[PDB]
Amino acid sequence: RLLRAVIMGAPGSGKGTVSSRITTHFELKHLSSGDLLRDNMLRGTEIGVLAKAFIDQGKLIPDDVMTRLALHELKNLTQYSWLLDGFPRTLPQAEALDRAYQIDTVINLNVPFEVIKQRLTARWIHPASGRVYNIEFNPPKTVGIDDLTGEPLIQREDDKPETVIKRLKAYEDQTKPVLEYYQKKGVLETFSGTETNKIWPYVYAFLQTKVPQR
Numbered sequence: 001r002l003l004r005a006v007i008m009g010a011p012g013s014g015k016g017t018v019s020s021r022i023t024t025h026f027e028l029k030h031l032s033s034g035d036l037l038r039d040n041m042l043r044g045t046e047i048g049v050l051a052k053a054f055i056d057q058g059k060l061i062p063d064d065v066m067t068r069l070a071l072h073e074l075k076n077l078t079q080y081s082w083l084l085d086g087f088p089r090t091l092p093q094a095e096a097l098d099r100a101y102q103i104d105t106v107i108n109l110n111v112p113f114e115v116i117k118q119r120l121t122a123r124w125i126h127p128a129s130g131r132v133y134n135i136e137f138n139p140p141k142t143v144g145i146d147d148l149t150g151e152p153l154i155q156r157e158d159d160k161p162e163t164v165i166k167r168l169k170a171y172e173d174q175t176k177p178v179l180e181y182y183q184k185k186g187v188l189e190t191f192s193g194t195e196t197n198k199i200w201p202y203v204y205a206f207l208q209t210k211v212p213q214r
């Protein structure tokens, strides 16, 4: 029985690392919606040029366009086990996928909002030199100040708390209905924690019962 699986998780939850580890350790194809969109944009395909019109303006791909593109790639993977990552992002996408393929497993990484917010707002920059500081992993010697010059550090707009809060709220509004949909279908498996390396062993053990290791 070939795996039909989806992985879900907020930005900063560790979903990217967990997906990368699943792909290393198990014999399956990783289908990332972002990677698929970027490949089409790079090649200038008809759907890549349309996708770039939205992405360049900070907009989601319309549901109908995104579903079209994902289903077209899935046609080429039907002899393999797969893991969907980034699709479905919205309830209409999940409903359209349900009319195309039986999805047997959905993994959700449940990491607290405050943990993700701190991760996503940790980066500070010294603009003139480009030096990067991360208050969790590489803090400056003096708070808010560059180590070599004593000049102020700044945050880039995408890393400021105001921007991150709007990003997380949009994600939740889009994907909470998808999580509830899969819970109703009986296929949702939730992994809760605050550290990726503490969550991974449990995801690994769960998948060992479902798809061959490489």
Ligand SMILES: Nc1ncnc2c1ncn2[C@@H]1O[C@H](COP(=O)(O)OP(=O)(O)OP(=O)(O)OP(=O)(O)OP(=O)(O)OC[C@H]2O[C@@H](n3cnc4c(N)ncnc43)[C@H](O)[C@@H]2O)[C@@H](O)[C@H]1O
Pocket (backbone or CB within 6 Å): 010, 011, 012, 013, 014, 015, 016, 017, 032, 033, 034, 035, 037, 055, 058, 059, 060, 061, 062, 066, 086, 087, 088, 089, 090, 093, 119, 120, 121, 196
């Ligand atoms: N289905 C769809 N429908 C409509 N439109 C769609 C669509 N799919 C895509 N699009 C559109 O196209 C665009 C595609 O972009 P998108 O698909 O959202 O980006 P991505 O690069 O493919 O996302 P990844 O899954 O690879 O996550 P990541 O590893 O980079 O980490 P993260 O950023 O979460 O987190 C980064 C921060 O978290 C921290 N962090 C990450 N991992 C850890 C960890 N394990 N432990 C501690 N901290 C961590 C990092 O330090 C960092 O600060 C979208 O914006 C959208 O507009």
Ligand SMILES: [Cl-]
Pocket (backbone or CB within 6 Å): 010, 011, 012, 013, 014, 015, 016, 017
């Ligand atoms: Cl992540």
Ligand SMILES: [Cl-]
Pocket (backbone or CB within 6 Å): 122, 123, 132, 133, 134
């Ligand atoms: Cl950083």
Ligand SMILES: [Mg+2]
Pocket (backbone or CB within 6 Å): 016, 019, 032
């Ligand atoms: Mg990735």
Ligand code: NA
Pocket (backbone or CB within 6 Å): 138, 139
């Ligand atoms: Na340092």
